[PDB]
Amino acid sequence: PIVQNLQGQMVHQAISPRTLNAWVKVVEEKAFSPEVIPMFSALSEGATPQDLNTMLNTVGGHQAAMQMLKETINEEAAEWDRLHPVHAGPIAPGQMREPRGSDIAGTTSTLQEQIGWMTHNPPIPVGEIYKRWIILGLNKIVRMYSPTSILDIRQGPKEPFRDYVDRFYKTLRAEQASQEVKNAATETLLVQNANPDCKTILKALGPGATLEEMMTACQGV
Numbered sequence: 001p002i003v004q005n006l007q008g009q010m011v012h013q014a015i016s017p018r019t020l021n022a023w024v025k026v027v028e029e030k031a032f033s034p035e036v037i038p039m040f041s042a043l044s045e046g047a048t049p050q051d052l053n054t055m056l057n058t059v060g061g062h063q064a065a066m067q068m069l070k071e072t073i074n075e076e077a078a079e080w081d082r083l084h085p086v087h088a089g090p091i092a093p094g095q096m097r098e099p100r101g102s103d104i105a106g107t108t109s110t111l112q113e114q115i116g117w118m119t120h121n122p123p124i125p126v127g128e129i130y131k132r133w134i135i136l137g138l139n140k141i142v143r144m145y146s147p148t149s150i151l152d153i154r155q156g157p158k159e160p161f162r163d164y165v166d167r168f169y170k171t172l173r174a175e176q177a178s179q180e181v182k183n184a185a186t187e188t189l190l191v192q193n194a195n196p197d198c199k200t201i202l203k204a205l206g207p208g209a210t211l212e213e214m215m216t217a218c219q220g221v
Helices: 017-029 036-043 049-058 063-083 111-118 126-144 161-174 179-192 196-202 211-218
Strands: 002-004 010-012
Touching: 010 111, 017 036, 017 049, 036 126, 049 111, 049 126, 063 126, 111 126, 161 179, 161 211, 179 196, 196 211
Parallel strands: none
Antiparallel strands: 002 010
16 A cells, blocks of 8 residues: 655555465455455555555455456446546646546556555545446445355354354344255254364254253353
8 A cells, every 4th residue: 555755755665475465365265245345444444546556466266256346347437537528638747647547446546646646635546446346346245156154154163052052043034035945954054063073962862852852952162
């Protein structure tokens, strides 16, 4: 992002390799979860357009998602330009030429220009604007490849099994799913998602173990 010299200039500092590594870990682990979006926003705090593109190149192997981001970015850039028509006249010594859509996406603009816009009084916040376009894109990605569920409800290593059951069923009840899907959830996913020690106990019960029998079996595991 942007930092000030002891000589007073606003200069660019590349994103830390640790911030970058975190972002790449988030994407690796949080596939296409709604959870990616808040993380992306936290990790990209202060980012210039150049920095944002740096983050995206790091997860570019996701080609279908990158394609979706491209189309969103092109769309928003096109609307920006409609709202911000080019003005050919001279620029007064105390004005600054406005960014185009491609300047915001970092395509036709330099880091120096991005910093000049971002730190103007008041700012032309091209980092924040580009970040919004990316977020629009990410929301479209999750919404396209992501249904609601209970799949990530997992018993904690020290979680009492009765508490896990409660969470599981609460999540279950609030979903809009067919009964046959919910039947699989109660009869198989609950055990599937129990912790290692409880699952092993649960899987050694009989053919017709009742949930009460399950709770009895896993109490204090």
